[PDB]
């Protein structure tokens, strides 16, 4: 009767940034989706592959759950098919995805009146991201014939610009936390059911 830890991943303090998104593997549940459904302020609660109302009696085998912090505008890009800055270089979903995308509005919790520069995002990559793949390669793009030995400047650019998140910005640039549930059914006896 061990209720599996959505509490370790929903009401947590410091969600990681989007370039290194932590991936909690939830397993051996008796998962109760009645604890997150009773909430007004969810900005998006879209689901794919399963209707969100009847999530109780649908037995899966593994339920991956991700987390990051993005702008309010770019929650549009956490969706199957859309491309841009976040779903190309930071966190890409495949177009057979079978889970839910949940957001918030955390401006009170994740933004001081000065520059909160603790969240980073990726600006470029040599190729687009394979679905569910994370890169922590914080190495300078060389981009010229000269090697520049890890100090940026002309012709050598850093691959992680910083978020700022001041609370005088906007409803679309104050930071929106996002937790992505992902359900899957790989060929093993049932594990997650409430």
């Amino acid at each position, epitope marked *: 009767t061990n209720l599996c830890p959505f509490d370790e991943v929903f009401n947590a303090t410091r969600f990681a940034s989007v370039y290194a998104w932590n991936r909690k593997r939830i397993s051996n549940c008796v998962a109760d989706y009645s604890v997150l459904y009773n909430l007004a302020p969810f900005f998006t609660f879209k689901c794919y592959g399963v209707s969100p109302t009847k999530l109780n009696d649908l037995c899966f085998t593994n339920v991956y759950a991700d987390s990051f912090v993005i702008r309010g505008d770019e929650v549009r890009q956490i969706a199957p098919g859309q491309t841009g800055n976040i779903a190309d270089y930071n966190y890409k979903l495949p177009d057979d995805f079978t889970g839910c995308v949940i957001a918030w509005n955390s401006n009170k919790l994740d933004s001081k009146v000065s520059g909160n520069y603790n969240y980073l995002y990726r600006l470029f990559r040599k190729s687009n991201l394979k679905p569910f793949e994370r890169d922590i390669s914080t190495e300078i793009y060389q*981009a*010229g*014939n000269k090697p520049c030995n890890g*100090v940026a*400047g*002309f012709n050598c650019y850093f691959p992680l610009r910083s978020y700022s998140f001041r609370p005088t910005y906007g409803v679309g640039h104050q930071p929106y936390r996002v937790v992505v549930l992902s359900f899957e059914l790989l060929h093993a006896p049932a594990t997650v059911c409430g």
Partner: antibody, heavy 118, light 107 residues
Framework: EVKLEESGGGLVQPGGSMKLSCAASGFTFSDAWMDWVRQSPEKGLEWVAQIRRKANNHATYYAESVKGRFTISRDDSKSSVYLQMNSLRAEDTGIYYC??????????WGQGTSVTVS | DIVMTQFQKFMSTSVGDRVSITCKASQNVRTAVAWYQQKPGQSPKAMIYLASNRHRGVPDRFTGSGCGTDFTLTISNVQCEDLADYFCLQHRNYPLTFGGGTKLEIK
């Protein structure tokens, strides 16, 4: 917003010297690869010189056509970039633009100074 | 050194067409190519940096790509005031140079 200012539209007899300034505004001067280019109708656009960031020792590079005759020096206190040229000929005639940065973002350009020779 | 050949000094198109400004290089530069426009009587701007992305504040009609030794720029639905000069630039080695120029005029 960021704007760049430049001075010294001048006429010199061949064999003189010329040093021009570039005061900036609106952005952090201490990290910018402020460069310099040249416009002339006979040459298209040429590249002149460069002074790089603060963290890279103010690394300096010139065009090989004007080696020795020119020099550059920035100063982050007065938010300025000076470029000095000496012993000029009829080759170095033309408008000199003043660059915030080349070939990345923040690529703001000045307005040129009508620099000529006799 | 690294020279750029701009082999069409005058391209002639009208409104609603598709234009392809060209810029040939010397040898293989990886992605380090810039693209500048210059409205007549003013200072140039940045259209495309690093030959793939486009600048913050220019429309999506100005787009360009390519890799290798040859590069070009594509203008879709050219309006009444995209009428200017166009230059490409390499910055592989510190001998830097621009292109030569490309002047548009509506027929």
């Amino acid at each position: 917003e960021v704007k760049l200012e430049e001075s010294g539209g001048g006429l010199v007899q061949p064999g003189g010297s010329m040093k021009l300034s570039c005061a900036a505004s609106g952005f952090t001067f201490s990290d910018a690869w402020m460069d310099w280019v040249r416009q002339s109708p006979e040459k298209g656009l040429e590249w002149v010189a460069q002074i790089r960031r603060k963290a890279n020792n103010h690394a300096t590079y010139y065009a090989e056509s004007v080696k020795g005759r020119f020099t550059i020096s920035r100063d982050d206190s007065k938010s300025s970039v000076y470029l000095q040229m000496n012993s000029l000929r009829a080759e170095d005639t033309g408008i000199y633009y003043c660059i915030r940065g080349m070939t990345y973002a923040m690529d703001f350009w000045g307005q040129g100074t009508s620099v000529t020779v006799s | 050194d690294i020279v750029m050949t701009q082999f069409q000094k005058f391209m002639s198109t009208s409104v609603g067409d598709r234009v392809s400004i060209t810029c040939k290089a010397s040898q293989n530069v990886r992605t380090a190519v810039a693209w500048y426009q210059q409205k007549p009587g003013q200072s140039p701007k940045a259209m495309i940096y690093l030959a793939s992305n486009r600048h913050r504040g220019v429309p999506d009609r100005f787009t360009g790509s390519g890799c290798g030794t040859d590069f070009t720029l594509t203008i879709s639905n050219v309006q009444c005031e995209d009428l200017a000069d166009y230059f490409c630039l390499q910055h592989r080695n510190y001998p830097l140079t621009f292109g030569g120029g490309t002047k548009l005029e509506i027929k």
